[PDB]
């Protein structure tokens, strides 16, 4: 019931993140944005070019083993 | 310049 899943920012850095499918991917945001050392509204997260919004999960997004989620400037 | 694997687990 958890995933994987591959976040990658601007300077192609990654942090990968075991997550359930089940989960709101808000606690995703805020602990990647904890790591770089920057506010959560500071970035934009998508999966396939779209915005992940704090209540989303992994299963509502199709997201699967291994995917990524790219981080861009807000 | 490689970094290493981060896996973290929520």
């Known amino acids: 019931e958890y995933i994987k899943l591959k976040v990658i920012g601007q300077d192609s850095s990654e942090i990968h993140f075991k997550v359930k499918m089940t989960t709101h991917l ?3 945001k805020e602990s990647y944005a904890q ?4 506010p959560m509204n500071s970035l934009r997260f998508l999966f396939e070019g779209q915005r992940i919004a704090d209540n ?3 299963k509502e997004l199709g997201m699967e083993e291994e995917d990524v989620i790219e981080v861009y400037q807000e | 310049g490689e970094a290493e694997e981060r896996i973290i687990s929520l």
Do not use: A, F, I, S
Request: glycine share 10%; proline share 10%; aromatic share 0%.
């Open chain 1, 56 to 58: 989303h999960t992994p």
């Open chain 1, 26 to 28: 808000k606690k995703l």
């Open chain 1, 35 to 38: 790591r770089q050392g920057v």
